[PDB]
Paper text:
Here, we describe a multi-reservoir, high viscosity extruder as a step towards automation of sample delivery at XFELs. After commissioning the device with lysozyme crystals, we collected time-resolved data using crystals of a membrane-bound, light-driven sodium pump. In two commissioning beamtimes at the SwissFEL Alvra endstation, we validated the general performance of the multi-reservoir extruder and determined 13 structures overall.
Third, we demonstrate efficiency gains in ligand-soaking experiments for structure-based drug design (SBDD) approaches by solving the structure of the anticancer target tubulin in complex with both small molecules (some of which are approved chemotherapeutics) and with new photochemical affinity switches for the optical control of tubulin function. Notably, 27 ligand-binding sites have been identified in tubulin so far56 making the protein an excellent target for SBDD. To demonstrate how this could be exploited for SBDD, tubulin crystals incubated with single ligands were loaded into individual reservoirs. These reservoirs (loaded simultaneously into the multi-reservoir extruder) were sequentially measured without disrupting the low-pressure helium environment of the Prime chamber and without entering the beamline experimental hutch.
Residue numbers in the entry:
A (entry chain C): 1 to 440
B (entry chain B): 1 to 42, 45 to 360, 369 to 438
C (entry chain A): 1 to 439
D (entry chain D): 1 to 42, 45 to 360, 369 to 441
The structure:
């Protein structure tokens, strides 16, 4: 009941999916062959972990997930890796030719050849559900498949599932690990296209994650592997409310009510603490107060922006591990008197708290120290608009000269689609301004 | 005037309702299986007000459990006295109401409401002479607020001449689940003004303040708040459940307590409330119960009664005590605060005494006031509503379920009229 | 024998009726069984007690009474009680739900549905009367049933038995006892609708009975039982002339003749003496002069008021026990010289005296001590208008704000009835002022 | 897989093509017989891009050898890896082309093009997923420049959505004294500007100057020039042949490197290039490599990047090195030369690192630049064309095959336009 189907699109979506499902398996005690010794319900159940795993008669716990990519090399690693026995072959869909970092190819030329097959597999997953709650979609902004195919997919899902809720986990481009100079184009196009079809979207700034790995983890040159293990910790914290239950656990949809005051303003800022290496964790024991203060340090955000220069519209704190409410309350009382936390005048100044008692988990060979308690903060702040502004600026620099545009026109797109998307971004920035202005 | 049909809806409605049935079952000598094991026939003289008789000297609560998600009612089945409820009176959906009044009242709730009415109708048919209905719910969520008020409207349609009575929990930022609570509560108050005869306003802000300031509990849980609610619900219903010098029912109570049809929102209170642990054994006295029962800090809906006037007051004392001392104390309390009682309703304070104290206490007192200071409560919700509504924040959760802004504007106007009505009698 | 039929309406009427019929049986030596050994005429007779009791061929003595309540729990007590065998089922009429302290609900809503059954049961008792003189009606002012249903009943009795007399025993509301907030409303509404249908009404103020029980019986917190046993002693004093051989107030018309010169001013003040605690071991026996003086003490009256500041229209002294006319005349000679007793100019300044030789009976286990002589004074004085002033003032306070009015309009009554009744009360106060004052 | 079809036309095309196959066969562990004998599995992960897998674990170059004279064919066949090429993929004529572009493009070449297309089709039909074609040829002669650009047109008509990639050797009087080379080149650039998606400009003038001034070689031979070509071709195809993230196929490279369809002519460079005497006393480091592949004298096109602006740049490092250091050095060089990079294309320098170094080097670096300064190359060929066309020298040589004079005028005006475009984007500002 309340099942969630995860959809991993493109290299970023797939590799992040890999990280997440390995971590989920560790958190629930599911082995790489799908067996879950601790589950005495054989063939099914209504446990909290069933929101994410279906069960076969032979006792296998199978991710409610589809992995999709327009070329095979990335999914082939899943097909031959440690968790290859976890997924049914039908959940892993690949084409033969990718989108060449081109949104036009992902949404049209190549995407149209595989979209129906993908929807058919999603339908098979949906039919196994007694109360499908919605979808979680993992993709990059910059790739041709992550942008174009994801947009196409979201539009088709709005047709087949109506207003059934669709959440995004989106990789926002950063120069340090960038693979295309056209990532700003793809980013603006996909954001314009999916804006109406997404209910909530968690952006992960690759530069922010890169910086956190370098600073807090003492990793000289962080790879995708480093970044993805951190990202999965954030995703796990966000979905823990769906996968575990407890007296003080709060469902993600309850937070979602607080996080989205208007349909378009649906981009929460995530912060996660503590991020610390084993070497540095061997000495300090980080208290509830310490990790909560960490949440209001700009260097710990998943998107580079300055919340001090914006206004808050919602703050949710998602604790997991050894945390009792008395200590949360005392911590929050401290932050309210030491930090510059300005709310809009139309929204109550209050922190929404959820606590999961299951301790954070680390993957063996990881870089994160095992800690006793952790917190993920989700806030809706106008400061996240800074991220849109930087992207829009790169778009404008190239689009004034129409650089690289012929690659999109050649694949059937028109310049009108570009200026449409950019005006929608301009309106989004103006929206973030209006919600911040004091009432009359 | 015998049978009352009880309905509890949503998470808060079912949690407080379950405690209500635990507490009064203990008082009436009913065990979690429904068998009587008490020592007095005082326990059984009016047991039929709230319980039906089955086969084998079994007593079954005349109670209907409603929710749009199964979680809370599984907790009720698994909890103490879960076995006491009629299995067929559990009516629940699977979708939930997402803390959304519109979902509870118009879309998800509309699909479940007829099933609930089948059970209500079946229970009413078994009543020798049905008095009316009591409903437990919160106003800040979706099922209790939205579907509870939908249920009330349907019941008034099918039983227009019976008393409709609610125990309604008001939201507060101090104990809040979502920001949209002021929307859900304003929409519900508009329904209550129109379709209930008596409404006990149980304010989560006051419950919190009592647990914090008075009982010295740093981290108040819903369990603490609900123990306060259970004690107040037991006290207000004493007169209905036990024999005494008062043969009252819901209708006589309403005629005596409600001078104008819209002003039917009561301010309940309980005494004693004492933090641990030395005083816990100290013998409490009638003058201390009477003075504590009228203290503003002891009220379960906090609207400093000193800022308003009392239209009517009912006071219920429980345990063995001197009725002469009770009279003297109530008289002197009135003489000491007679500026706080409207002079145009003579003898508007009524005292009742019941011999059986609640479990755990030698004596107690329960306050029921119809005071103009309740306006502060509606004023508080009204401000939270307008701060958001003026910017139309969070409206999309409601507009997407079919509602439009006019309905919000109407509810807000109706509640401001209620405030100015209370204000009108505060100065007369 | 001219027979008299008692109608007991609502909780107060029924409980007072219980107390009265218990006391009647004790006074006439009628067993709870219904047998009366001293009655040698089996199955009939023309004795004075036959005015209140019928007879069966089996020697059962049946009260000429009817009990009406709109809810059953109070009459149930009559059914399952000591004198349960005295009555038969046709005499006890119960309903399902009561009038909720709402005059309109008792008169209009629920009364309409049960009035014909009640009159049918009354017609059955009247059909067994060779010469019915009229009715004695017991009810509270404040109850919904006692006020609303009673007035409807009085209207119908005036239609079905136009010639017969109707006497009221009425309980005036008092906060010290157990009053609902809207009792003043019901009191004025019922007084207005009944005014022209009642020939003589005996008001008993619960406040006065309460204080008599505290002051003279040392009862800390009087219950309905204490109050009703004292009230029934008063009622017994008033009806004894109808239940025993005698020549004063021997039929109901005589009550009007001796006590009510103006029909509207038909509210006699009852004063009773002595009230002696049954706990007091050694009590000195009061003389005729002493109990007769007590008849002029405000503390002994059924309504707290000051007869000194009023005018008398009639006075009736009813003695029970060891009393001789010589001592009554001596007592009257003294009282007239030591008291402020002013009569209206258009009446004689005099006293109608009645002596019943049989002494007051006290319920075994009651609060009242057996005495050798008692007196009940019935005086038509304008001072009782104080009771109306108090009531009308409370009415004005609520009615000025229309407080609680919606409860009455909701049952089909028009708001205008409220004003009509209040003007009638203003006229009643004015009538008293004319009879009693001399600017 | 994501297969590439290789085509080599003419003398120059077949010489540099053959060395290309020799060098990458060594890098992937393929012996001259076509058997695999390497150690690392990275050698076979993407072997399919350039090799078919036949029976017996043999690997056959997906290559087509074309010429208008039987010569070379034999030298290739009687060379180091001659027995590795598929016998049916040799398509040769006899008449020759005599360094006459018209003979290659319109007459004798046209007579042979259909035989070549059948082999192209036969190789393509067996590709699991063909990505495009690469052609090696010269612009100075007749077969490669004339029949090569004809092959390009014919292939572009049957596979219009595939990438057309060329390695085009530019003519210089310091290496070839054949007089009509300036004419042949101009006719070829006219074709390349319109029918190829990406063209590596391999300049014989620059190869000559690197050998003379940097390697200090008295008399540079074609073997020297071709060793530079083979090192560059190895580098610029590293990302295609080994597992990697950046520029992993022809289309992603083009999408990253070609901001405007006509400006698709790349300027390659290689590092290290060290004179024999200095190698012993010159450290081989990441800062050394980065500094040197941005040096104007190290470009394999005779031009000065300091004279123009970089539209886009791809840099590829090979061998065991520190990713942190590469990142720091590449940013350093962009910071210290910022004015030389157009400001309206953010993040226009992309960097890949492959762990497998080329033969004989601990580490190397390859530069692929799309710079406006390449206009200098097209100006040089334009100068030599206008000094040979004003007096109509040799025109008959081409009119004798049917060509009108305007075809020379259009091929020249189109090249002047190409220069003007490079200048247009060289002067465009962002503010
Ligand atoms: C009358 C009480 C105590 C008391 C005071 S003096 C005496 C002899 N007893 C009760 C009040 C009962 O109505 C019930 C509400 C109490 C709520 C508790 C569940 C509370 O959460 C608990 C943790 C407490 O703080 C106390 C145990 C101190 C509680 O008894 C407070 C109180 O007034 O209890
Ligand atoms: C610079 C070189 C090596 C080196 C090793 S340590 C260092 C600073 N440099 C190699 C690089 C090899 O890619 C090959 C290009 C050389 C082409 C040869 C045909 C060249 O013409 C040859 C005759 C030479 O000049 C040397 C033999 C000195 C050559 O090995 C050095 C050189 O520049 O190439
Ligand atoms: N955090 C993270 N970012 C990644 C990962 N893989 C790619 N990216 C980023 O995603 C962007 C490129 O999108 P990709 O996912 O590689 O592209 P794709 O969806 O395969 O699209 P095409 O290859 O064009 O069909 C760049 O900004 C990369 O840095 C990954 O595993 N983790
Ligand atoms: N003296 C005396 N007063 C009584 C008794 N019972 C009720 N009262 C008084 O009567 C008034 C209330 O009227 P009730 O007789 O209870 O009401 P009712 O006629 O039954 O009408 P409803 O119950 O409203 O339908 C109050 O003033 C009570 O104090 C009684 O037994 N004796
Ligand atoms: C069964 O429950 C109750 C029912 C009633 C009353 C009441 O409060 C004492 C109750 O117990 C709490 C009641 C209330 C208020 C009154 O005055 C405002 C009144 O006049 C009168 C009353 C009650 N009557 C008396 C004499 O107390 C009748 C209605
Ligand atoms: N006092 C009290 N309040 C509660 C309880 N549960 C929920 N609430 C309050 O009820 C509101 C949320 O309503 P809820 O009952 O959960 O929603 P519903 O299930 O849709 O009807 C919030 O203001 C909560 O503070 C409870 O057990 N006790
Ligand atoms: N770098 C290089 N250039 C060559 C080679 N062979 C010929 N050239 C150049 O090729 C041009 C003429 O090309 P050629 O192969 O003879 O023409 P074709 O065979 O008729 O197409 C001249 O400018 C030569 O400098 C070679 O092996 N390497
Ligand atoms: Ca299971
Ligand atoms: Ca449903
Ligand atoms: Ca139905
Ligand atoms: Ca007889
Ligand atoms: Mg991919
Ligand atoms: Mg809830
Ligand atoms: Mg009654
Ligand atoms: Mg040659």
């Amino acid at each position: 009941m309340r099942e969630c189907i995860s959809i991993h699109v493109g290299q970023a979506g797939v590799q992040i999916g890999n990280a997440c499902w390995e971590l989920y398996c560790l958190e629930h005690g599911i082995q790489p062959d799908g067996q879950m010794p601790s589950d005495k319900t054989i063939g099914g159940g209504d446990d909290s972990f069933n929101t994410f795993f279906s069960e076969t008669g032979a006792g296998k716990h199978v991710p409610r997930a589809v992995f999709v990519d327009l070329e095979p090399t990335v999914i082939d690693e899943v097909r031959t890796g440690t968790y290859r026995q976890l997924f049914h072959p039908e959940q892993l869909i690949t084409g033969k030719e990718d989108a060449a970092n081109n949104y036009a190819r992902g949404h049209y030329t190549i995407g149209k050849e595989i979209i129906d097959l993908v929807l058919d597999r999603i339908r098979k997953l949906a039919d196994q559900c007694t109360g499908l709650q919605g979808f979680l979609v993992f993709h990059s902004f910059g790739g041709g498949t992550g942008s174009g195919f994801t947009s196409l997919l979201m539009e088709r899902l709005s047709v087949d599932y109506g207003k059934k809720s669709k959440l995004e986990f989106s990789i926002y481009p950063a120069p340090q690990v960038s693979t295309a100079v056209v990532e700003p184009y793809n980013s603006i196009l996909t954001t314009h296209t999916t804006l109406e079809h997404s209910d909530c979207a968690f952006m992960v700034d690759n530069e922010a994650i890169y910086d956190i790995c370098r600073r807090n983890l003492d990793i000289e040159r962080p790879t995708y592997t480093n970044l993805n293990r951190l990202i999965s910790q954030i995703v796990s914290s966000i979905t823990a409310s769906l996968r575990f239950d407890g007296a003080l656990n709060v469902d993600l949809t309850e937070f979602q009510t607080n996080l989205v005051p208007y349909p378009r303003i649906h981009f929460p800022l995530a912060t996660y603490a503590p991020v610390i290496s084993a070497e540095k964790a061997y000495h300090e024991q980080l208290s509830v107060a310490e990790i909560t203060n960490a949440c209001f340090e700009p260097a710990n955000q998943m998107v580079k922006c300055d919340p001090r220069h914006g206004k808050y519209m919602a703050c949710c704190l998602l604790y997991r591990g050894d945390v009792v409410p008395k200590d949360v309350n005392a911590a929050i009382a401290t932050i309210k008197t030491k930090r510059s936390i300005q709310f809009v005048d139309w929204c109550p100044t209050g922190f929404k708290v959820g606590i999961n008692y299951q301790p954070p988990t680390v993957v063996p060979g990881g870089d994160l120290a095992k800690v006793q308690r952790a917190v993920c903060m989700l806030s809706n702040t106008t400061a996240i608009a800074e991220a849109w502004a930087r992207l829009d600026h790169k778009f404008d620099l190239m689009y004034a000269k129409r650089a690289f545009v012929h690659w999109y026109v050649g694949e059937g797109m028109e310049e009108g689609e570009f200026s449409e998307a950019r005006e929608d971004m301009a309106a989004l920035e103006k929206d973030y301004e209006e919600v911040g202005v004091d009432s009359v | 005037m015998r049978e009352i049909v009880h309905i509890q809806a949503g998470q808060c409605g079912n949690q407080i309702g379950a405690k209500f049935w635990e507490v009064i079952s203990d008082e009436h000598g009913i065990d979690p299986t429904g068998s009587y094991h008490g020592d007095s026939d005082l326990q059984l003289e009016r047991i039929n007000v709230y319980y039906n008789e089955a086969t084998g000297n079994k007593y079954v609560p005349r109670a209907i459990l409603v929710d749009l998600e199964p979680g809370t009612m599984d907790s009720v089945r698994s909890g103490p006295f879960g076995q006491i409820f009629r299995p067929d009176n559990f009516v629940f959906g699977q979708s939930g109401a997402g803390n959304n009044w519109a979902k509870g009242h118009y879309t998800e709730g509309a699909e479940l409401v007829d099933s609930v009415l089948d059970v209500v109708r079946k229970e009413s048919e078994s009543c020798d002479c049905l008095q009316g209905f009591q409903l437990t719910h919160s106003l800040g969520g979706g099922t209790g607020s939205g579907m509870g008020t939908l249920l009330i409207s349907k019941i008034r349609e099918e039983y227009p001449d019976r008393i409709m009575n609610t125990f309604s929990v008001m939201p507060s930022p101090k104990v809040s689940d979502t920001v949209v609570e002021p929307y859900n509560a304003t929409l519900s108050v508009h329904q209550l003004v129109e379709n209930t005869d008596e409404t006990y306003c149980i304010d989560n802000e006051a419950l919190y303040d009592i647990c914090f300031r008075t009982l010295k509990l740093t981290t108040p849980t819903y369990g603490d708040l609900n123990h306060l609610v259970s004690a107040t619900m037991s006290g207000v219903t004493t007169c209905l459940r036990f024999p005494g010098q008062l043969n009252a029912d819901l209708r006589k109570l309403a005629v005596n307590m409600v001078p104008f049809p819209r002003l039917h929102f009561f301010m309940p209170g309980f005494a004693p409330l004492t933090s641990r642990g030395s005083q816990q054994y100290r013998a409490l006295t009638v003058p201390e119960l009477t003075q504590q029962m009228f203290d503003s800090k002891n009220m379960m809906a906090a609207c400093d009664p000193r800022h308003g006037r009392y239209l009517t007051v009912a006071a219920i004392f429980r345990g063995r005590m001197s009725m002469k001392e009770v009279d003297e104390q109530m008289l002197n309390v009135q003489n000491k605060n007679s500026s706080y009682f409207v002079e145009w309703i003579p003898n508007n304070v009524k005292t009742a005494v019941c011999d059986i104290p609640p479990r755990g206490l030698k004596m107690s007192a329960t306050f029921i006031g119809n005071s103009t200071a309740i306006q502060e409560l509606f004023k508080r919700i009204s401000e939270q509503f307008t701060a958001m509504f003026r910017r139309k924040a969070f409206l999309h959760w409601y507009t997407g379920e079919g509602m439009d802004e006019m309905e919000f504007t109407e509810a807000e106007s109706n509640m401001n009229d209620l405030v100015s009505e209370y204000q009108q009698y505060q100065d007369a």
